Symmetry: D2
Subunit: 315 residues, 4 copies
Amino acid sequence: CTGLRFTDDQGNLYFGRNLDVGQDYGEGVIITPRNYPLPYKFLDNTTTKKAVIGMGIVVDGYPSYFDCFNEDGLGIAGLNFPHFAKFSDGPIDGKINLASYEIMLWVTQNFTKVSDVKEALKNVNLVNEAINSSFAVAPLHWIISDKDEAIIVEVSKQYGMKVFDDKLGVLTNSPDFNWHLTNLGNYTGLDPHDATAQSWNGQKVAPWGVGTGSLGLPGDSIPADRFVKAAYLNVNYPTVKGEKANVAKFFNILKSVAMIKGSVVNKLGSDEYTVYTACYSAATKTYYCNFENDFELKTYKLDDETMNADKLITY
Amino acid sequence: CTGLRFTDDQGNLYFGRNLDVGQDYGEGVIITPRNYPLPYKFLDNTTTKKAVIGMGIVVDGYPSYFDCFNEDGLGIAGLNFPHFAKFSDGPIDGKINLASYEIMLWVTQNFTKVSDVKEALKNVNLVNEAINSSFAVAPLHWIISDKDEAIIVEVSKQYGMKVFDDKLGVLTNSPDFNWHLTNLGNYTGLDPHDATAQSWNGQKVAPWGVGTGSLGLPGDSIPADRFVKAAYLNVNYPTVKGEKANVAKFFNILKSVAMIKGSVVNKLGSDEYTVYTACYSAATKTYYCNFENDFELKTYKLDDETMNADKLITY
Amino acid sequence: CTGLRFTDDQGNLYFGRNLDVGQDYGEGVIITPRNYPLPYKFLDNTTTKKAVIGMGIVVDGYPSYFDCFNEDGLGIAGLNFPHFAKFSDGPIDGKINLASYEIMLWVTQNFTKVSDVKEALKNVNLVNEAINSSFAVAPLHWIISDKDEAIIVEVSKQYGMKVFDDKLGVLTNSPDFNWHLTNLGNYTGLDPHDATAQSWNGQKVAPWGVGTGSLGLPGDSIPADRFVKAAYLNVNYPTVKGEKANVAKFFNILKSVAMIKGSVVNKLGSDEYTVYTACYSAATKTYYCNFENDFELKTYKLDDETMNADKLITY
Amino acid sequence: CTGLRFTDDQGNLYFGRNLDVGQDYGEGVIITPRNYPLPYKFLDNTTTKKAVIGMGIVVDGYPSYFDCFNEDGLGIAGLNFPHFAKFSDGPIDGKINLASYEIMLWVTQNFTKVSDVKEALKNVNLVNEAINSSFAVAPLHWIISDKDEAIIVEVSKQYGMKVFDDKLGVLTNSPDFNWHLTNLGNYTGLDPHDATAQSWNGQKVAPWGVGTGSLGLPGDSIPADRFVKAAYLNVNYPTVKGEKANVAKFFNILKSVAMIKGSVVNKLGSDEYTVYTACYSAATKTYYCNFENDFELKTYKLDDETMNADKLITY
Ligand SMILES: [K+]
Ligand SMILES: [K+]
């Protein structure tokens, strides 16, 4: 998986992710309307303060999201964090206890500003518990963003719960976020500007085509390498104007770092690849997505009809 | 640029390209109908006998194509070949003399089989002449394909005219095609299969995520590096079923190797990037494209209406 | 810098380092004999009880070592650790307080087993103080080894004091040691075994020479890349027999990852390169070294003569 | 194998090679004195015009050299050239016919200047024949050098006989020399100057140590990779003064690109590694060498005693 966010020159947010997996979970776009029932394992059951949209599966009436985005422009995406993610054996007294899967709706329902999310997380404890005993607990970490800031939430056996400011606007998978930040120092030789003709002891050595300044940029799907490349592309991609250009920019970047079918076979013999790529535009409250076997952009919207529905809207 | 071709298991051809440039040239989709006037600089003037579709620019009624594809499922794309391409100073008696830009329509009008093209190219002479003196001659090389085979045509100062069978289904830019073929032997270490946990003198060393077998796959836009990655992806991408899946597979591959805006600045200070990606489906006579600033797939079609029109159709 | 240790099949230790710097420090080989005065900044002054040998400089009669090795087969090397190394403002009551430069002789004088060192370091506090006002405090970390185990000692602002078991037998520079261990997992695609001929959709793609399994092995001098390569080389180098063969193996590995003059120019305009390579053979109590401008191996030995001298012996 | 040459600022030549093979061949230093019997397969038998020194094997009184250097400062080294090298099926009338192994003494016996060698090679034909039936023909190419110029000689099935000027002063193995020269253009991003602190959207991204400018420099033993690194190191290594410093510079470069035992296993299960490194100093007529299992520099010299001996001098 790769998560990505950026804004245009006016603070309109574009935020989304590739889902890179080796199986079909049956996911689809789900709109959760306002005042929908919202049960919690360790908190008072309530109803939704806000409408949200995202990709997920419905389980006994509960919309379980891979990523979701609220009508007020705040979103979250859960990304695989294997060999690292580790949650509580059970709830802890005096903490806001959440089964890990509950963080998706806890964040998007209760907040609009990442600043408030960060303050609240100081008292959150994530618990190693699935929605029911028929599901395993996914080892995830999360990227959360509004128009001003993205943060990373990681709860690991190694380090406990850590929350990072993510000025790069990207996230991939293991290892931990600070490891990846540190890795970027090793790629400061990367330069968008082309090299030019040189004299190697009088032998002319000159580029054959453009792109020579990014010598050493990795193109494989190892999480560390997609992090380096996603960050490099995001920070150097110009700011563009308008919905179409910003959505295209977003898909240009994530399709660049997609996991291509056939090029990755896991130890069990299964292909792993980018099954979908999705972008939420906060400005238009529109969720854009396409799929490995269907490249046409599909669009779904939080609007008057959908946000005020009486039930979950599934597509 | 990157050209790409493959088929499904029924022999349906998908064939197209990224155009990587620093500039919008004002190009667009042009359908050239049957019976359209076709002058030549050295051959007899005639008319088109086959409808073609592709991206290009109209100059004084003449459609000058970046890529184009005839109704019988054979196509050609011209890609940048700097520091190599060089054509004859003039026509040569006894040869089929073509100003280099004329190869696009000469190929698509006169052939349905690449085996016929390869035979006729033995007596072809490309000439260093533009449609008129108000235009430069572009230093190009070409990939030509039908459902059965792709060939590369290169005319260089270094080696004269060479025609290669292209079983990899790909082409990028300089240097010459045999140089790139030879380069692939240096990447035989690439493996789609993940590595697994190792013992380095008792220290556990194990992958953090999937993708570790392709260690060393380059991710920059240097032509040689895009050639290795495009070829690697194409031969390992499985055969897929149906029009939507094959079109998506095509764009999955070419967007993976696209030149991302801001990540490449040429020596004159201009961004170079993939301005469009296009795919011709022979089976549906459909030209699909999207653009750097508009990601939605657009479709243009050779059908009874467009193939028999009285004029060039421009969109 | 790169530090390196391994043994033969009989537990004879070979342990040393490259010194990669951009200034001439006038270093030379120093033997400190038994019963030599040994002042401390915070501990009671004393005398040496074990002869040591290594490279360093003499300050006011004090041998300040880059690396040193005692007659009982235990040694230590200090390597640059910039942007990480951070020692305490002053001594802490209750701790064994050492100015950081004092760890060299404190380790080699008081210990013959790394397991005792590990235990004792639990009460050590390193202090940010140089030998005198005219010297800056060097931002170092250390590798310590006997014939059975190597440990890394790092004291950082980020993490405080950490002590690691170093099964890879290597150390370079920043960042911290657990970061480097973690990085190794991204290189599990490395394989000493050559690849063999492949068919890329019927195109024969085959190695031109040996070595194709180590595709992606980095050859630059970034510390993380020298760490990967040094570790890979050390753990895959066969065990060899005898002093000559083990010393050559040692220099083969370290010269492979040396920083070559002219290939690295620091931000101040100065060449940085491997000024010397040194190997201590515990079995023969011999210090072998050569220099950037003189490749002949020079040998210096802890002798009945030298170990019982009346003064420092400086070459 | 890697061949290497350079001069100091007085035109003093230092020229040598790594031999990278799977097993020791029993080779050793051989001095061939003046007036020594010199048979030829297809030329008149004669005696040596000059004394030469190098590494090789004596076969029935004939010194068969891996590299040899004459008393007037001209030398030659034969390196592996598999999948390319192809010599003529028998001698050709009108040519100077040499069994490929005979080029070693023919060049060093008959010439002082590389300019004269280049002119003479216009009439040379290399024949596919070994010294006798007990040996196979090795697929070799050659680097030849004096104080002014180095040339590469390659005779291939693909291109016939080619002679190149080698301003880089390096040679490795396959593919052909022009392929490698062309490859260098893809490494123009290499820069000895360190990168400096950067702001990635406000995130400080800065080097952890020196060496960041050479990002992407390959460190594996694939011939194309060692060629890039050897060329890069040689042209950027400063000119140094005096015999000791120049010999050390020479071993610094070649040991940097040595093939390290255990890191390369060919497809027949054999380790491949640098068995020796050797440097001929023309100014002192001294052959220096060390071996994988003995790092001490050994020295052998052409002087009045050895150049006027009455037999081969072996060591
Ligand atoms: K509840
Ligand atoms: K003869």
